[PDB]
Design an enzyme around this catalytic site. Structure first.
Site, PDB file in Angstrom:
ATOM      1  N   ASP A  47      -3.805  -1.123 -17.035  1.00 43.39           N
ATOM      2  CA  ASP A  47      -5.154  -0.626 -16.775  1.00 43.39           C
ATOM      3  C   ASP A  47      -6.148  -1.779 -16.560  1.00 43.39           C
ATOM      4  O   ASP A  47      -7.194  -1.562 -15.967  1.00 43.39           O
ATOM      5  CB  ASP A  47      -5.605   0.285 -17.931  1.00 43.39           C
ATOM      6  CG  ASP A  47      -6.595   1.388 -17.525  1.00 43.39           C
ATOM      7  OD1 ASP A  47      -6.923   1.540 -16.330  1.00 43.39           O
ATOM      8  OD2 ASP A  47      -6.962   2.222 -18.385  1.00 43.39           O
ATOM      9  N   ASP A  78      -1.766  13.531 -26.316  1.00 36.88           N
ATOM     10  CA  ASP A  78      -0.359  13.682 -26.637  1.00 36.88           C
ATOM     11  C   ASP A  78      -0.045  15.049 -27.261  1.00 36.88           C
ATOM     12  O   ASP A  78       0.749  15.836 -26.721  1.00 36.88           O
ATOM     13  CB  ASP A  78       0.052  12.489 -27.521  1.00 36.88           C
ATOM     14  CG  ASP A  78      -0.784  12.259 -28.801  1.00 36.88           C
ATOM     15  OD1 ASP A  78      -1.855  12.895 -28.968  1.00 36.88           O
ATOM     16  OD2 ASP A  78      -0.343  11.413 -29.603  1.00 36.88           O
TER      17      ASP A  78
END
Lengths: 46, 142, 845, 144
Positions: free
Chosen positions: C302, C446
């Protein structure tokens, strides 16, 4: 009286009887619990 | 002379029994004579042989003194009246003996013995025996 | 007492001995008065106690062991009393056919497995007949359900007098103690039902009989406590449901034909972590035992850092960066999913080093079960967390996460409710694409992704074998910051995608997801329990409107039965009372962000958690300790007012004051534990050492080979134990030989330290291939992490209570280690009282 | 050879005395404090030889029983032997009924609980110290 308070009044002086009934209830709820957990694991195998 | 001072050893028990009997009222206790006897036993002797001799001498003396302190008839009275006791049947003698012997007292003496054996390991019993003897003498003088 | 007087009264040898001793006492810091008194007592002891006797000689020789609290060289005037007390203690409580009883107890213990094995045979034997009339069977098992529920309802609702309640309590406690000694899963189920029956009896009594309606202040404080108790009871019920039958799922073997093995993309997302952290995860991922044509490894950077691009090219792995930093880890994975083509995706955090066996241990179930969309493995950590580090309890006590991965997720698999935990998981690509990838709407992407997969009717599994290990958080500040994010995210899911009302989830899955979300709401109830006894002490508010004896006769059964049942089920994964320290440390920090998320779920930024920093000195984080110090001071004002109420208050309230004071003292022990964790301990090593016993060899430059055993390793070096007389010198260059299966690898090392047979090796600069081989010979071995989980001792509630009491004093001593007020000055008073307390609780020899 | 290595706690006899104390407290026993002390003293007496220990246990068993019987109001063996011929004529059903009436199941349960308590406490505390203390105390009360 009613029926829920009559049962309470009849059992109020018998703590040993209630402890035996509690032990029986624990065994019955547990054992059926064992069997039915085995059954749910079998439904999982399904 | 420090090394030669040996506590009253087994004689501690002798005096404890005497005290117990005195307390029970079975003994006429002569405080000074018993103190003298204790003093004799505490006297510092350097030689091991003198110690043995002391024990040998002390045994008869201790017995004599104990008897003297007891209300028991003098050996002379027993010898002069003993010929009358020789005619008693064995059953009577046993009965007399059983009546005379307080099994409770014997048991107490035993308990005291065990206590003494146990305590003599933790505490100097001689110090207490001498203190009590001194105290009893003071009471007789006051 | 060199006083002309002793010279006149005592003979010269005696005087010389006494003076010598006196001087000896003075040299060791004893006051004149104490020294004189000591000499006096000695003399007295000599007079009354035969110190020459072998008994007293032994006692004198062991004096330091028997009387640790009494310094023979520094006599104190009260020393005799201390000796008496200690002696009394040694004489009484101090011990650590009848002999046959012991052996036969073990004989029956050995029989337990044997009889259990026979019982399992009979289990099948009775099933070898367990059949009849299904409609009726349902009636009869259902007939058991109705009669036993009626009996349980009578046991819950029955009013008792104090004596009948005490008899009933003692009998139920006796039954629990008998059942706890029975081995197997059936005794755990009996303890759950018994604990639930007693806890329902407690809550029933609370709702019906213990609210004061005539006093508004008592009513409001009583309702606030009843809310916290109702929450705790719901979490107890749902907790027992979740862990009632842990599945212990075993690996399924893969097909012998590797042509049938599916394609896998491994994703390693990084944001701002150092390349040295990410290197180990990539080098281990290259070592995974999978066909190379079917394995693709991706660095998801990223940060768009050129060092990571060059590293990826040099190592032959795929690299992807993005220009939009949206949705952090979830957005980074979802960008990579556009370019990845594998049938499965595996995700590792950039610090999690996978084992070579990871795909072999997980993939076999996806071939067996076509509806399996996700498989989760434990998060294991080879560095201590801040609780383990600051308390000095690394690998001695199960860490906070061990309950969740060791038991809760294995309990979830029974219910098809195992959720993704962000790392160490395999996900089937087709189900993941059908839900639009990783969820981005919540800061726990998640757990929310798993909820979406389950809503589509896909299944999830748990494999309770550590197959990767990562780095823990390096400060309590970073740890609390991570827990704040998870707590916010789980409550955001509860508001945005509610498990109870939303469609698609099975009833059991709803309860498991609700319990996982409810667990993070514990902060408010925990703060209520830490302040509840102060309502009576400070405000005169009757939070429980009942006689103090009735409070004890209802609360103690509930606490004892819940603790005994939790110790039996959770005792390998959580020691008793340690949950209360972990929850108390987090409670203040999770309460505001969870309440805000409950009202407005869209108010949340994602923060990244730092990993890889050094703590160079011990320091108290005063910003983090502020709430704990405030709660300690507030409870101490409670103690002061409770002492005042005990002496000047109504005689009728004395037992209520005592019960409230016992609760405030309990809260002060737990808060002392929270303060003890807030003292950051020094982290001297950059590289964490992983203890591991493995065979190795060392070659000297002269060609001599010596057998050794690796004891520990790290990224920069290894501790080895040499087998035999190796003449190895400090600074010498030596080649370390490690084995991976049938292949041997050579690593250039320098001897950094020699301590007899223990040699510290430093790694020399490795080539890229040697560094790959080193990680694959160490961190990425198949056995490295699996052996660590089974090493924790079984919970003993009374030993754990004593460990927390010691920790709290240590934490009291930690608020003393650092205090901004007389708080520590109080601890100064506290420790004079605790020298008195070393005298008290008899020191176990 | 310090007679000391030879001092062994009352071992199983601790339970014997505890039971006696419990019965005394219930009013079922006429406790003779001095005789029981003597017995305790006999049991505590230091014996060097293992063989003497065995002998003590063998001797102590009949003595302990005899003493326990003595402390109870139970009729002397003579009374039982002289009246025993009258008991031999009782039907087995009567004997069982008599026995069931005589045996208080609550007392048996108490003794069992006491046994468990003793086994449990003996792991932590030296029960002998307490037994001896109580014995000494009871004797003092009888002399005051």
């Amino acid at each position: 009286l009613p029926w829920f308070e009559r049962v309470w009044y009849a059992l109020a002086n018998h703590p040993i009887l209630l402890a035996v009934l509690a032990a029986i209830s624990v065994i019955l709820l547990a054992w059926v619990l064992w069997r039915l957990l085995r059954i749910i694991s079998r439904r999982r195998l399904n | 002379l420090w090394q030669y001072w040996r506590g009253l050893s087994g004689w501690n028990f002798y005096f404890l029994v005497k005290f117990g009997l005195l307390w029970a009222g079975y003994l006429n206790f002569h405080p000074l004579l018993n103190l003298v006897f204790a003093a004799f036993l505490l006297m510092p002797l350097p030689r091991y042989s003198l110690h043995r001799l002391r024990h040998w001498i002390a045994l008869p003396i201790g017995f004599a003194l104990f008897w003297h302190d007891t209300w028991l008839p003098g050996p002379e009275s027993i010898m002069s009246q003993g010929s009358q006791v020789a005619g008693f049947s064995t059953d009577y003698l046993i009965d007399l003996v059983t009546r005379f012997i307080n099994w409770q007292m014997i048991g107490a003496i035993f308990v005291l013995l065990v206590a003494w054996l146990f305590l003599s390991q933790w505490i100097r019993i001689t110090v207490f025996v001498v203190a009590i003897l001194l105290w009893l003498n003071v009471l007789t003088l006051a | 007492m060199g006083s002309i007087l002793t010279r006149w009264l005592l003979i010269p040898p005696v005087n010389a001995r006494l003076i010598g001793r006196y001087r000896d006492y003075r040299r060791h810091g004893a006051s004149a008065f104490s020294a004189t008194l000591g000499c006096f007592w000695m003399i007295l002891a000599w007079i009354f106690i035969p110190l020459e006797h072998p008994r007293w000689q032994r006692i004198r020789a062991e004096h330091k062991n028997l009387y640790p609290h009494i310094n023979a060289s520094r006599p104190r005037p009260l020393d005799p009393v201390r000796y008496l007390i200690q002696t009394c203690w040694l004489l009484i409580g101090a011990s650590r056919g009848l002999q046959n009883i012991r052996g036969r107890y073990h004989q029956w213990m050995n029989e337990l497995p044997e009889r259990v094995s026979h019982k399992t045979q009979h289990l099948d034997e009775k099933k070898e007949l367990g059949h009849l009339s299904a409609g009726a069977r349902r009636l009869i098992l259902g007939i058991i359900v109705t009669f036993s529920l009626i009996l349980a309802l009578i046991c819950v609702t029955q009013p008792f007098n104090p004596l009948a309640q005490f008899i009933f309590l003692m009998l139920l406690w006796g039954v629990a103690l008998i059942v706890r000694r029975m081995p197997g899963r059936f005794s755990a189920l009996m303890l759950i039902v018994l604990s639930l029956t007693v806890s329902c009896r407690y809550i029933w009594w609370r709702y019906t009989s213990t609210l004061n309606w005539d006093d508004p202040v008592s009513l409001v404080c009583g309702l606030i406590l009843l809310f916290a108790e109702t929450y705790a009871w719901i979490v107890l019920v749902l907790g027992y449901f979740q862990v009632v039958w842990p599945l212990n799922r075993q690996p399924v073997p893969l097909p012998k034909d590797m042509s049938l093995w599916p394609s896998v993309d491994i994703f390693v997302p990084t944001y701002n972590e150092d390349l040295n952290v990410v290197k180990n995860t990539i080098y281990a991922s290259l070592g995974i035992d999978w066909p190379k044509d079917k394995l693709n490894i991706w660095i998801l950077d990223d940060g768009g850092r050129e060092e990571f691009r060059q590293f990826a090219q040099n190592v032959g792995v795929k690299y992807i960066a993005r220009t939009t930093h949206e949705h952090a880890k979830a957005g980074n994975i979802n960008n990579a999913l556009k370019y990845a083509k594998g049938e499965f995706v595996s995700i590792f955090d950039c610090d999690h080093v996978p084992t070579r066996s990871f795909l072999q241990m997980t993939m076999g179930w996806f071939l067996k079960e076509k509806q399996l969309a996700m498989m989760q493995t434990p998060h294991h950590f080879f560095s201590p967390d801040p609780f383990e580090r600051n308390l000095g309890r690394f690998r001695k006590t199960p860490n906070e996460g061990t309950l969740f991965y060791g038991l809760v997720q294995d309990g979830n698999d029974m219910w098809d409710a195992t959720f993704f935990c962000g790392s160490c998981a395999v996900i089937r690509r087709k189900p993941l694409d059908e839900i639009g990838g990783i969820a981005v709407e919540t800061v726990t992407e998640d757990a929310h992704t798993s909820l979406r997969l389950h809503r589509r009717g896909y299944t999830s599994a748990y494999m309770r074998i550590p197959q990767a290990a990562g780095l823990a958080t390096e400060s309590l500040s970073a740890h609390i910051g991570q827990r704040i994010r998870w707590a916010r995210g789980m409550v955001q899911i509860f508001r945005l995608d509610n498990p109870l009302t939303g469609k698609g989830l099975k009833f059991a899955q709803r309860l498991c997801y609700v319990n996982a979300m409810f667990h993070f709401l514990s902060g408010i109830p925990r703060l209520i329990f830490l302040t509840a006894p102060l309502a009576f002490l400070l405000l005169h508010a009757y939070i429980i409107y009942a006689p103090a004896l009735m409070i004890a006769l209802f609360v103690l059964p509930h606490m004892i039965h819940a603790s005994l049942t939790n110790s039996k089920i959770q005792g390998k994964y959580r020691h008793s009372f340690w949950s209360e320290i972990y929850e108390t440390v987090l409670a203040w920090y999770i309460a505001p962000p969870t309440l805000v998320a409950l009202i407005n779920p869209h108010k949340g930024k994602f923060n990244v958690t730092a990993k890889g920093g050094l703590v160079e000195e011990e320091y108290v984080d005063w910003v983090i300790s502020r709430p704990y110090i405030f709660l300690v001071l507030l409870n101490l004002v409670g103690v002061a007012v409770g002492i005042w109420r005990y002496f000047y208050g109504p005689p009728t309230e004395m037992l209520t004051v005592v019960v409230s004071m016992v609760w405030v003292f309990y809260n002060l022990i737990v808060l002392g534990g929270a303060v003890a964790v807030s003292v950051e301990s020094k982290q001297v090593r950059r590289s964490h050492r992983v203890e591991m016993t493995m065979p190795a060899a060392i070659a000297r430059e002269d060609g001599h080979l010596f057998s050794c055993t690796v004891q520990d390793f790290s990224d920069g070096g290894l501790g080895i134990k040499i087998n035999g007389q190796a003449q190895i010198l400090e600074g010498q260059k030596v080649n370390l030989l490690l084995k991976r299966g049938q292949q041997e690898y050579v690593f250039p090392t320098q001897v950094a330290r020699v301590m007899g047979n223990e040699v510290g090796l430093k790694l020399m600069p490795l080539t890229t291939q040697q560094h790959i081989d080193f990680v694959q010979c160490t961190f990425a071995r198949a056995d490295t992490w699996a052996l660590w989980q089974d090493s924790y001792p079984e919970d003993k509630p009374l030993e754990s209570l004593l460990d927390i009491l010691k920790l709290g004093f240590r934490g009291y001593r930690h608020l003393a280690e650092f205090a901004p007020s007389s708080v520590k000055g109080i601890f100064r008073v506290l420790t004079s009282l605790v020298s008195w307390v070393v005298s008290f609780i008899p020191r176990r020899p």
